[PDB]
Amino acid sequence: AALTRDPQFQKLQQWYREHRSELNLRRLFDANKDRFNHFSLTLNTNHGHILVDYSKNLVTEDVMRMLVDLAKSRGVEAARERMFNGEKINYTEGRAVLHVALRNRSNTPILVDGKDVMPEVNKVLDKMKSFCQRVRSGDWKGYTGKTITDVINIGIGGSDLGPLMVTEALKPYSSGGPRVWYVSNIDGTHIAKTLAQLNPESSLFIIASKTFTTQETITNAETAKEWFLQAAKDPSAVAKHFVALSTNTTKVKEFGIDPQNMFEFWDWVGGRYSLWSAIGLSIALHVGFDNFEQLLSGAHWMDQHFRTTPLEKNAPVLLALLGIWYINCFGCETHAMLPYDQYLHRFAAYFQQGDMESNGKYITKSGTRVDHQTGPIVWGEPGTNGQHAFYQLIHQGTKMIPCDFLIPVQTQHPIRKGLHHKILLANFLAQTEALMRGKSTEEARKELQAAGKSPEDLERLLPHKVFEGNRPTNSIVFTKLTPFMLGALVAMYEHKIFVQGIIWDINSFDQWGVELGKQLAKKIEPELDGSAQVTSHDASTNGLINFIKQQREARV
Amino acid sequence: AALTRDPQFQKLQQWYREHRSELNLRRLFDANKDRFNHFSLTLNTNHGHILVDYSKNLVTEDVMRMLVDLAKSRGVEAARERMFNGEKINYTEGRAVLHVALRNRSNTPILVDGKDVMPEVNKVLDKMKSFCQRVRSGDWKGYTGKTITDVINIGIGGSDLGPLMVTEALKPYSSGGPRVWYVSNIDGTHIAKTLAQLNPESSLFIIASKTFTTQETITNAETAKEWFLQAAKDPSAVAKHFVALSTNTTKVKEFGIDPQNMFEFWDWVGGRYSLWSAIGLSIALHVGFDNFEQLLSGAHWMDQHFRTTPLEKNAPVLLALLGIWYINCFGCETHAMLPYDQYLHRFAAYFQQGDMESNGKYITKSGTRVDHQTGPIVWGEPGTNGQHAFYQLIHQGTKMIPCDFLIPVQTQHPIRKGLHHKILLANFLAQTEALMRGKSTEEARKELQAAGKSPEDLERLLPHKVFEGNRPTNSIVFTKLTPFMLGALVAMYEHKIFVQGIIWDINSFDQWGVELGKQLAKKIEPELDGSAQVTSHDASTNGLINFIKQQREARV
Ligand SMILES: NCCNC(=O)[C@@H](O)[C@H](O)[C@H](O)COP(=O)(O)O
Ligand SMILES: O=C(O)[C@@H](O)[C@H](O)[C@H](O)COP(=O)(O)O
């Protein structure tokens, strides 16, 4: 791989191997009095501030210098320009990568195959706006002439997780919008338990699918259509209760959806970057097109910040480089995203798709296998809940986990005169601090003595109450979680992923594993029907199928 | 540490270092025709079957022999007996570990301080049963004489995640039960968005807290009580709408809860093992006490299976030992739990608490630091959704992740004459297979040629569509996800965790980490009030607080 061959990478690996033991957070904070100032970024978006405090990380002045040097050496700025200019950086599929275009509020031209994509981008948005205004008011009526109370998105993966996470995150902005439902799994539970709660007279179905061929989405869409027509009995009513979000015009019309009920997007819109496109119609229906514009505007601000800011002060760039430092030097397999916000319960899950589906690769731009670590395993749950659970392994486990702590300063619900948010903020701060400093053998001994413990019981219990500390955190604090701020935060991580993949020399925009998954369950599918034994596969698969066939009619 | 010193452990490490390259799944399955039979367990509970297919793992006959040898050498059977007999195996806190007692349907005596715990266990269950029957029918009325339509659990961690996961998993058994709500986070969003949907005339609040001191739970409980009394105006009505689940009798009465509205449990009931106790009152209210009995009965079956089965055929034992093999030899930081069931969406999250809060340790039984890896990072999301996302890093990443695939044979919703479940089953099977076999350079070349690709475009795209394979899976197939089967499945993993912690010589039942978290916020809490700058902490913490104080009075 090209990365292991790089001179700045080898310089960074050499420093790490020599000065690893001298990287102590408690020792560094009382050495450099202005460490916070030297290792933090204040971003003013004019719609809220973002503090990216990376001072609780295992870096000095020299380490950040070398990491910035690697970004230049791997050609991050050049690669960035190729993306924003509309060049075909998704080489494996022969596609541009333009999620940035979907939110380009400046309307500055972006050229794909000598043609500006912007007029078509803005046209779909206009169609979205009109549709939303029509549905949300009551202008768009059902087959019985009833106003839409329920919006149902049928889609999986990128055609699901984006709008799900965003509608959950921006829930208090959904006043006077219809309820949103998200059917994704093939599991009949998902579609069945949903339809049992809906009335077909006042329900709108959205068939979110880029290809419009995906088994899960199409099957779920056909079931809903069958469920709807069982009560309506009129094929003409489908044009009132069904809309599609796709690139494939032929497949949409073939399904039975009116060609004027289709909201287009393009192949340079990857699934895990599609919420910004027509895929976000469910978001725009829930919180309104105004808030959806604000969402795109926030992302736009972050795109502009990423493109114009020097690398040493660039937010997604610095976050990405801290990642490289822990993955390719410290050996960290994981990266934890811990939002101190209940609206952001699906945030960690969204970037579990976003990051892992992008940087979960092993083949370079040339075609050679990598001889270094690529993308991490991304996971997390909102605070404070995690403190009472997995934080135990973070504080006292045997594995290093770099964490991203995130929190709005202002809460959507300032109940009890701000008492709940005050505790939430206090906990946010205290936890990052505790991970940094810890509790020594002497500090634990003094605490046990004041409470009341005998020298025989105290000494046995002593090492168990000791916290080694020296665990790295990023503290990302923002003014308020508004549509705009969420847009900026999502886009920040989008480019964080992008920068990492460029350094690793991998394609962050192909998905050959998920492409494989869409073909696999066609070989096994016919072999499940009947009661006859299967031997066409390996010993494991065969045995599994025969067990399934056996247990199929068993009374329990 | 005692583990690294063990002779069987060193024998296993030596085999791994010599015969790592000879462990190829494709090579093994066409060598041993009956590999499935040699590496799988069929368990008949008489309330459904469980197939634990561990044949897709990187083990031979010799490896399983050595792993069983390590279990004996570390004294797993002896330690097991100490737990079930009521001995104080939670040495650090001086407590027994008896979640197994809470579900002991045989009623065989278990002695703690020379006294049988069973009569007190069964007494709380009787009180639970009566209360449930009273509430679910309509016998227990509100302050306005209205029947309870809404049940709200206020608790965090172990006082939350168990009942949440179980009520979500057993949702189709909740017919004629009240709706269940789960408030956990201190974040005022959680409590506020809930109360906005409830009517205080028909709402029952459950204050789930072992200690009854926890800041999150108590604050959330006080807010709900204040919200209730704002509409009721009578302190006597609190005895009609508020109940407590605790060990502390004094704290419950102090809060204002009637002493006859308390459902007791004990200190040998750890939070992450408390769903079985009075903590599961929300479960019993939702699906009924009969189904809650079935849940405990299923766990009981699994406890009995764990206690009586020889180690080489024991389910939690084998699953635990495969974990040790990947963590302490292969170096795997993570373990993925992937249920192919939409009712089990919180299953992976529950064991993220269960496993990580138990085995996230670094100090032995003696007090010495470990010189080996302990518990993994546990994560996952339900199938098939994951296939379109993070499975990319599982199939083509640079990190080894052992996966547990789980699926019921029978579905709660067999819609479209079983079409949805057929696809779900097909996908379950095809994915575990693909991870095992993969796709070679020649297999990928032949597929691209049949579709239609030029020799110049085909060769550039070829290495990117190649799957190395040789990725381990466990396929756990069960007849149906019923209250009983869920109980067995949860208990299976409970003991899996237990066996692992015994081999590592750590205390799987202490939680210094979470106990630290409950004290940390006290120092920062008063320093947040006002607009004055803070300098009492380190540079990072100080800067963070001053940013918060600044953005407090911004308007967006
Ligand atoms: N087995 C321990 C599991 N993990 C925990 O102890 C915490 O999550 C515990 O459940 C919560 O902190 C709740 O505390 P309380 O129940 O009010 O005393
Ligand atoms: O990340 C992805 O690309 C996947 O999650 C896809 O979004 C998913 O396969 C949906 O299918 P499509 O959008 O192609 O209809």
PDB file of all heavy atoms in Angstrom, chain A residues 114-137:
ATOM      1  N   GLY A 114     -19.534  17.518 -18.319  1.00  0.00           N
ATOM      2  CA  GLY A 114     -19.695  18.819 -18.973  1.00  0.00           C
ATOM      3  C   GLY A 114     -21.021  19.533 -18.740  1.00  0.00           C
ATOM      4  O   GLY A 114     -21.310  20.512 -19.432  1.00  0.00           O
ATOM      5  N   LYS A 115     -21.821  19.046 -17.792  1.00  0.00           N
ATOM      6  CA  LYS A 115     -23.148  19.600 -17.539  1.00  0.00           C
ATOM      7  C   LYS A 115     -23.344  19.920 -16.063  1.00  0.00           C
ATOM      8  O   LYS A 115     -22.964  19.127 -15.193  1.00  0.00           O
ATOM      9  CB  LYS A 115     -24.255  18.643 -18.040  1.00  0.00           C
ATOM     10  CG  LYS A 115     -25.600  19.312 -18.241  1.00  0.00           C
ATOM     11  CD  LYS A 115     -26.789  18.388 -18.020  1.00  0.00           C
ATOM     12  CE  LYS A 115     -28.057  19.213 -18.050  1.00  0.00           C
ATOM     13  NZ  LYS A 115     -28.467  19.554 -19.442  1.00  0.00           N
ATOM     14  N   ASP A 116     -23.933  21.089 -15.792  1.00  0.00           N
ATOM     15  CA  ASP A 116     -24.202  21.530 -14.425  1.00  0.00           C
ATOM     16  C   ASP A 116     -25.359  20.715 -13.848  1.00  0.00           C
ATOM     17  O   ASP A 116     -26.446  20.629 -14.446  1.00  0.00           O
ATOM     18  CB  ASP A 116     -24.496  23.034 -14.355  1.00  0.00           C
ATOM     19  CG  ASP A 116     -24.545  23.572 -12.917  1.00  0.00           C
ATOM     20  OD1 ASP A 116     -24.002  22.932 -11.992  1.00  0.00           O
ATOM     21  OD2 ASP A 116     -25.138  24.648 -12.703  1.00  0.00           O
ATOM     22  N   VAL A 117     -25.086  20.103 -12.697  1.00  0.00           N
ATOM     23  CA  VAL A 117     -26.049  19.236 -12.012  1.00  0.00           C
ATOM     24  C   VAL A 117     -27.057  20.054 -11.201  1.00  0.00           C
ATOM     25  O   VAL A 117     -28.192  19.602 -10.958  1.00  0.00           O
ATOM     26  CB  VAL A 117     -25.354  18.152 -11.134  1.00  0.00           C
ATOM     27  CG1 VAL A 117     -24.675  17.104 -12.008  1.00  0.00           C
ATOM     28  CG2 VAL A 117     -24.335  18.761 -10.178  1.00  0.00           C
ATOM     29  N   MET A 118     -26.632  21.269 -10.830  1.00  0.00           N
ATOM     30  CA  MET A 118     -27.398  22.172  -9.968  1.00  0.00           C
ATOM     31  C   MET A 118     -28.850  22.475 -10.387  1.00  0.00           C
ATOM     32  O   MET A 118     -29.727  22.473  -9.515  1.00  0.00           O
ATOM     33  CB  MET A 118     -26.610  23.463  -9.681  1.00  0.00           C
ATOM     34  CG  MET A 118     -25.427  23.282  -8.730  1.00  0.00           C
ATOM     35  SD  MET A 118     -25.747  22.192  -7.305  1.00  0.00           S
ATOM     36  CE  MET A 118     -26.965  23.111  -6.364  1.00  0.00           C
ATOM     37  N   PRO A 119     -29.115  22.726 -11.696  1.00  0.00           N
ATOM     38  CA  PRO A 119     -30.515  22.998 -12.072  1.00  0.00           C
ATOM     39  C   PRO A 119     -31.460  21.824 -11.808  1.00  0.00           C
ATOM     40  O   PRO A 119     -32.629  22.036 -11.437  1.00  0.00           O
ATOM     41  CB  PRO A 119     -30.429  23.301 -13.573  1.00  0.00           C
ATOM     42  CG  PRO A 119     -29.019  23.756 -13.786  1.00  0.00           C
ATOM     43  CD  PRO A 119     -28.205  22.930 -12.845  1.00  0.00           C
ATOM     44  N   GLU A 120     -30.948  20.606 -11.975  1.00  0.00           N
ATOM     45  CA  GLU A 120     -31.738  19.394 -11.719  1.00  0.00           C
ATOM     46  C   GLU A 120     -31.899  19.138 -10.207  1.00  0.00           C
ATOM     47  O   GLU A 120     -32.964  18.682  -9.766  1.00  0.00           O
ATOM     48  CB  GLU A 120     -31.170  18.165 -12.448  1.00  0.00           C
ATOM     49  CG  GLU A 120     -31.574  18.036 -13.917  1.00  0.00           C
ATOM     50  CD  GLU A 120     -33.069  17.836 -14.156  1.00  0.00           C
ATOM     51  OE1 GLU A 120     -33.595  16.727 -13.950  1.00  0.00           O
ATOM     52  OE2 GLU A 120     -33.718  18.806 -14.580  1.00  0.00           O
ATOM     53  N   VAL A 121     -30.855  19.456  -9.428  1.00  0.00           N
ATOM     54  CA  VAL A 121     -30.884  19.388  -7.966  1.00  0.00           C
ATOM     55  C   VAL A 121     -31.982  20.289  -7.402  1.00  0.00           C
ATOM     56  O   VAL A 121     -32.833  19.827  -6.620  1.00  0.00           O
ATOM     57  CB  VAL A 121     -29.498  19.717  -7.347  1.00  0.00           C
ATOM     58  CG1 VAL A 121     -29.581  19.911  -5.827  1.00  0.00           C
ATOM     59  CG2 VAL A 121     -28.479  18.633  -7.702  1.00  0.00           C
ATOM     60  N   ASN A 122     -31.969  21.559  -7.831  1.00  0.00           N
ATOM     61  CA  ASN A 122     -32.946  22.577  -7.397  1.00  0.00           C
ATOM     62  C   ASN A 122     -34.379  22.300  -7.877  1.00  0.00           C
ATOM     63  O   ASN A 122     -35.336  22.682  -7.205  1.00  0.00           O
ATOM     64  CB  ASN A 122     -32.507  23.989  -7.813  1.00  0.00           C
ATOM     65  CG  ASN A 122     -31.099  24.349  -7.343  1.00  0.00           C
ATOM     66  OD1 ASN A 122     -30.531  23.718  -6.451  1.00  0.00           O
ATOM     67  ND2 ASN A 122     -30.531  25.382  -7.951  1.00  0.00           N
ATOM     68  N   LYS A 123     -34.512  21.636  -9.024  1.00  0.00           N
ATOM     69  CA  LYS A 123     -35.822  21.257  -9.568  1.00  0.00           C
ATOM     70  C   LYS A 123     -36.518  20.200  -8.690  1.00  0.00           C
ATOM     71  O   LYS A 123     -37.725  20.327  -8.418  1.00  0.00           O
ATOM     72  CB  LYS A 123     -35.686  20.761 -11.005  1.00  0.00           C
ATOM     73  CG  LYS A 123     -36.984  20.715 -11.809  1.00  0.00           C
ATOM     74  CD  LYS A 123     -36.743  19.857 -13.037  1.00  0.00           C
ATOM     75  CE  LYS A 123     -37.646  20.203 -14.223  1.00  0.00           C
ATOM     76  NZ  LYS A 123     -39.089  20.053 -13.883  1.00  0.00           N
ATOM     77  N   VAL A 124     -35.766  19.172  -8.268  1.00  0.00           N
ATOM     78  CA  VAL A 124     -36.292  18.136  -7.358  1.00  0.00           C
ATOM     79  C   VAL A 124     -36.696  18.760  -6.008  1.00  0.00           C
ATOM     80  O   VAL A 124     -37.784  18.462  -5.491  1.00  0.00           O
ATOM     81  CB  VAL A 124     -35.321  16.933  -7.154  1.00  0.00           C
ATOM     82  CG1 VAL A 124     -35.955  15.861  -6.279  1.00  0.00           C
ATOM     83  CG2 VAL A 124     -34.933  16.307  -8.480  1.00  0.00           C
ATOM     84  N   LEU A 125     -35.842  19.645  -5.476  1.00  0.00           N
ATOM     85  CA  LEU A 125     -36.152  20.396  -4.243  1.00  0.00           C
ATOM     86  C   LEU A 125     -37.444  21.222  -4.331  1.00  0.00           C
ATOM     87  O   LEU A 125     -38.227  21.239  -3.363  1.00  0.00           O
ATOM     88  CB  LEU A 125     -34.968  21.269  -3.802  1.00  0.00           C
ATOM     89  CG  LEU A 125     -33.674  20.569  -3.323  1.00  0.00           C
ATOM     90  CD1 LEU A 125     -32.496  21.529  -3.325  1.00  0.00           C
ATOM     91  CD2 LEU A 125     -33.816  19.913  -1.947  1.00  0.00           C
ATOM     92  N   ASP A 126     -37.664  21.875  -5.488  1.00  0.00           N
ATOM     93  CA  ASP A 126     -38.898  22.635  -5.755  1.00  0.00           C
ATOM     94  C   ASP A 126     -40.119  21.711  -5.756  1.00  0.00           C
ATOM     95  O   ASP A 126     -41.167  22.053  -5.189  1.00  0.00           O
ATOM     96  CB  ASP A 126     -38.850  23.389  -7.102  1.00  0.00           C
ATOM     97  CG  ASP A 126     -37.867  24.553  -7.132  1.00  0.00           C
ATOM     98  OD1 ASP A 126     -37.693  25.273  -6.123  1.00  0.00           O
ATOM     99  OD2 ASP A 126     -37.270  24.772  -8.215  1.00  0.00           O
ATOM    100  N   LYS A 127     -39.973  20.545  -6.403  1.00  0.00           N
ATOM    101  CA  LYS A 127     -41.017  19.518  -6.424  1.00  0.00           C
ATOM    102  C   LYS A 127     -41.282  18.966  -5.011  1.00  0.00           C
ATOM    103  O   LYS A 127     -42.439  18.706  -4.643  1.00  0.00           O
ATOM    104  CB  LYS A 127     -40.656  18.394  -7.393  1.00  0.00           C
ATOM    105  CG  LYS A 127     -41.852  17.496  -7.727  1.00  0.00           C
ATOM    106  CD  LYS A 127     -41.509  16.359  -8.667  1.00  0.00           C
ATOM    107  CE  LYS A 127     -42.586  15.281  -8.552  1.00  0.00           C
ATOM    108  NZ  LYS A 127     -42.701  14.471  -9.780  1.00  0.00           N
ATOM    109  N   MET A 128     -40.208  18.813  -4.230  1.00  0.00           N
ATOM    110  CA  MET A 128     -40.304  18.402  -2.820  1.00  0.00           C
ATOM    111  C   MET A 128     -41.098  19.420  -1.991  1.00  0.00           C
ATOM    112  O   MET A 128     -42.080  19.044  -1.326  1.00  0.00           O
ATOM    113  CB  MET A 128     -38.907  18.177  -2.229  1.00  0.00           C
ATOM    114  CG  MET A 128     -38.256  16.861  -2.628  1.00  0.00           C
ATOM    115  SD  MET A 128     -36.535  16.747  -2.110  1.00  0.00           S
ATOM    116  CE  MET A 128     -36.698  16.152  -0.406  1.00  0.00           C
ATOM    117  N   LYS A 129     -40.683  20.699  -2.087  1.00  0.00           N
ATOM    118  CA  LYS A 129     -41.313  21.834  -1.395  1.00  0.00           C
ATOM    119  C   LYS A 129     -42.817  21.923  -1.637  1.00  0.00           C
ATOM    120  O   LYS A 129     -43.607  22.041  -0.682  1.00  0.00           O
ATOM    121  CB  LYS A 129     -40.636  23.151  -1.800  1.00  0.00           C
ATOM    122  CG  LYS A 129     -41.203  24.388  -1.118  1.00  0.00           C
ATOM    123  CD  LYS A 129     -40.433  25.635  -1.521  1.00  0.00           C
ATOM    124  CE  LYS A 129     -40.813  26.828  -0.657  1.00  0.00           C
ATOM    125  NZ  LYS A 129     -39.699  27.850  -0.759  1.00  0.00           N
ATOM    126  N   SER A 130     -43.194  21.857  -2.916  1.00  0.00           N
ATOM    127  CA  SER A 130     -44.582  21.926  -3.348  1.00  0.00           C
ATOM    128  C   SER A 130     -45.381  20.773  -2.775  1.00  0.00           C
ATOM    129  O   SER A 130     -46.446  20.985  -2.188  1.00  0.00           O
ATOM    130  CB  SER A 130     -44.654  21.925  -4.877  1.00  0.00           C
ATOM    131  OG  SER A 130     -45.980  22.141  -5.320  1.00  0.00           O
ATOM    132  N   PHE A 131     -44.844  19.559  -2.934  1.00  0.00           N
ATOM    133  CA  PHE A 131     -45.460  18.331  -2.406  1.00  0.00           C
ATOM    134  C   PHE A 131     -45.685  18.401  -0.890  1.00  0.00           C
ATOM    135  O   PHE A 131     -46.804  18.132  -0.417  1.00  0.00           O
ATOM    136  CB  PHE A 131     -44.637  17.096  -2.813  1.00  0.00           C
ATOM    137  CG  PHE A 131     -45.199  15.789  -2.324  1.00  0.00           C
ATOM    138  CD1 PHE A 131     -46.327  15.221  -2.917  1.00  0.00           C
ATOM    139  CD2 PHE A 131     -44.585  15.111  -1.262  1.00  0.00           C
ATOM    140  CE1 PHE A 131     -46.848  14.013  -2.454  1.00  0.00           C
ATOM    141  CE2 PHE A 131     -45.105  13.905  -0.788  1.00  0.00           C
ATOM    142  CZ  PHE A 131     -46.233  13.352  -1.389  1.00  0.00           C
ATOM    143  N   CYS A 132     -44.636  18.782  -0.146  1.00  0.00           N
ATOM    144  CA  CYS A 132     -44.722  18.964   1.313  1.00  0.00           C
ATOM    145  C   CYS A 132     -45.798  19.968   1.739  1.00  0.00           C
ATOM    146  O   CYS A 132     -46.637  19.640   2.576  1.00  0.00           O
ATOM    147  CB  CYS A 132     -43.373  19.361   1.894  1.00  0.00           C
ATOM    148  SG  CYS A 132     -42.170  18.041   1.777  1.00  0.00           S
ATOM    149  N   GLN A 133     -45.767  21.168   1.142  1.00  0.00           N
ATOM    150  CA  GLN A 133     -46.766  22.218   1.376  1.00  0.00           C
ATOM    151  C   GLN A 133     -48.186  21.733   1.091  1.00  0.00           C
ATOM    152  O   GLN A 133     -49.100  22.001   1.871  1.00  0.00           O
ATOM    153  CB  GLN A 133     -46.434  23.481   0.568  1.00  0.00           C
ATOM    154  CG  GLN A 133     -45.791  24.587   1.397  1.00  0.00           C
ATOM    155  CD  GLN A 133     -44.496  25.138   0.789  1.00  0.00           C
ATOM    156  OE1 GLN A 133     -44.473  25.664  -0.329  1.00  0.00           O
ATOM    157  NE2 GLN A 133     -43.408  25.050   1.544  1.00  0.00           N
ATOM    158  N   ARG A 134     -48.349  20.999  -0.013  1.00  0.00           N
ATOM    159  CA  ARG A 134     -49.629  20.372  -0.371  1.00  0.00           C
ATOM    160  C   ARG A 134     -50.124  19.312   0.635  1.00  0.00           C
ATOM    161  O   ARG A 134     -51.293  19.341   1.042  1.00  0.00           O
ATOM    162  CB  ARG A 134     -49.560  19.779  -1.773  1.00  0.00           C
ATOM    163  CG  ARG A 134     -49.566  20.807  -2.902  1.00  0.00           C
ATOM    164  CD  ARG A 134     -49.473  20.137  -4.262  1.00  0.00           C
ATOM    165  NE  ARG A 134     -50.649  19.300  -4.517  1.00  0.00           N
ATOM    166  CZ  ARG A 134     -50.842  18.556  -5.597  1.00  0.00           C
ATOM    167  NH1 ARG A 134     -49.932  18.515  -6.560  1.00  0.00           N
ATOM    168  NH2 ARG A 134     -51.961  17.853  -5.712  1.00  0.00           N
ATOM    169  N   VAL A 135     -49.232  18.403   1.038  1.00  0.00           N
ATOM    170  CA  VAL A 135     -49.548  17.337   2.023  1.00  0.00           C
ATOM    171  C   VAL A 135     -49.773  17.885   3.456  1.00  0.00           C
ATOM    172  O   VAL A 135     -50.797  17.575   4.080  1.00  0.00           O
ATOM    173  CB  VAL A 135     -48.494  16.186   2.000  1.00  0.00           C
ATOM    174  CG1 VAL A 135     -48.777  15.141   3.075  1.00  0.00           C
ATOM    175  CG2 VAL A 135     -48.459  15.506   0.649  1.00  0.00           C
ATOM    176  N   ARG A 136     -48.824  18.694   3.948  1.00  0.00           N
ATOM    177  CA  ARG A 136     -48.852  19.262   5.317  1.00  0.00           C
ATOM    178  C   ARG A 136     -50.035  20.184   5.617  1.00  0.00           C
ATOM    179  O   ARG A 136     -50.511  20.215   6.753  1.00  0.00           O
ATOM    180  CB  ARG A 136     -47.553  20.016   5.636  1.00  0.00           C
ATOM    181  CG  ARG A 136     -46.344  19.141   5.916  1.00  0.00           C
ATOM    182  CD  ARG A 136     -45.065  19.960   5.991  1.00  0.00           C
ATOM    183  NE  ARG A 136     -45.073  20.931   7.090  1.00  0.00           N
ATOM    184  CZ  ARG A 136     -44.657  20.688   8.334  1.00  0.00           C
ATOM    185  NH1 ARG A 136     -44.178  19.505   8.684  1.00  0.00           N
ATOM    186  NH2 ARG A 136     -44.711  21.639   9.251  1.00  0.00           N
ATOM    187  N   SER A 137     -50.481  20.945   4.615  1.00  0.00           N
ATOM    188  CA  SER A 137     -51.654  21.818   4.747  1.00  0.00           C
ATOM    189  C   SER A 137     -52.988  21.051   4.759  1.00  0.00           C
ATOM    190  O   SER A 137     -53.805  21.212   5.667  1.00  0.00           O
ATOM    191  CB  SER A 137     -51.661  22.862   3.631  1.00  0.00           C
ATOM    192  OG  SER A 137     -51.704  22.230   2.374  1.00  0.00           O
TER     193      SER A 137
END
